Amino acid sequence: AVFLGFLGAAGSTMGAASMTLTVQARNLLSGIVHLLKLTVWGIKQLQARVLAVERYLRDQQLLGIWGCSGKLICCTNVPWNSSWSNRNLSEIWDNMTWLQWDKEISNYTQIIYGLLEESQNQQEKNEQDLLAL
């Protein structure tokens, strides 16, 4: 088929990049990063090791508090406030790239992260009350 490679679809449309997410997901913790000798290269490599797991788990932490654990494409119950981006679907997924999309959605990325957070807290509270009978 195609298989562009790691970040190979960085310039492709959002919909086309949304079909090769495993390509980036698997390289978020591996690479080349057995004794711990504290030389100038050893201290350098140890930090490179702790830094990878740290950043990897911070993304999985947010993915957990949203109810999206172990997911690449999860859907939510947070509606799209058009003040975030009034662009239409066809001019988003068949037009923009993820890089320029993140550039314009950047202001509201912290707002959306809160709506996904409490929506998961209330949804799990709803599921518990439904299983109380």
Epitope: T13, G15, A16, S90, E91, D94, N95
Partner: nanobody, 128 residues
Framework: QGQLVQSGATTTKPGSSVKISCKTS????????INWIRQTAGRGPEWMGW????????????????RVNMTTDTEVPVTSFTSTGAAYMEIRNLTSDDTGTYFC????????????????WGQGTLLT
């Protein structure tokens, strides 16, 4: 955004072959097709053809099959998502019945069903 400034509106006489330019700004010139449209007075507006500033692939109507040369030169990176481009248009067995206003319009989307659709147009040029 996006701008498409066209060439001058000078005139010639039958038998010749004129070149029409179209300079783009405010968008990545490679990401969208470039269409050529003709609005004659003695006919309905006609789609002449589009070309890919990225892949070089061109597609023109059979009425212009062996009479038109469509060319574009490579863009110039201005920013990460902005570039300047240029598209060219020529006619072969030219007469005076091809008189009218000529436009250049870029594609609509980068993918889907309406990819090459003329969406953002130029100011046009008057001919012979």
């Amino acid at each position: 955004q996006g701008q498409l400034v066209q060439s001058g509106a000078t005139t010639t006489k039958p038998g010749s072959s004129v070149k029409i330019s179209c300079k783009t700004s405010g968008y990545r010139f490679n990401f969208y097709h470039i269409n050529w449209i003709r609005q004659t007075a003695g006919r309905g507006p006609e789609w002449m053809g589009w070309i890919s500033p990225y892949s070089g692939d061109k597609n023109l109507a059979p009425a212009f099959q062996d009479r038109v040369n469509m060319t574009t030169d490579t863009e110039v990176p201005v920013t990460s998502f902005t570039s300047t481009g240029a598209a060219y248009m020529e006619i072969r067995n030219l007469t005076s019945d091809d008189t009218g206003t000529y436009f250049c319009a870029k594609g609509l989307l980068r993918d889907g069903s309406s990819t090459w659709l003329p969406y953002l147009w130029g100011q046009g040029t008057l001919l012979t």
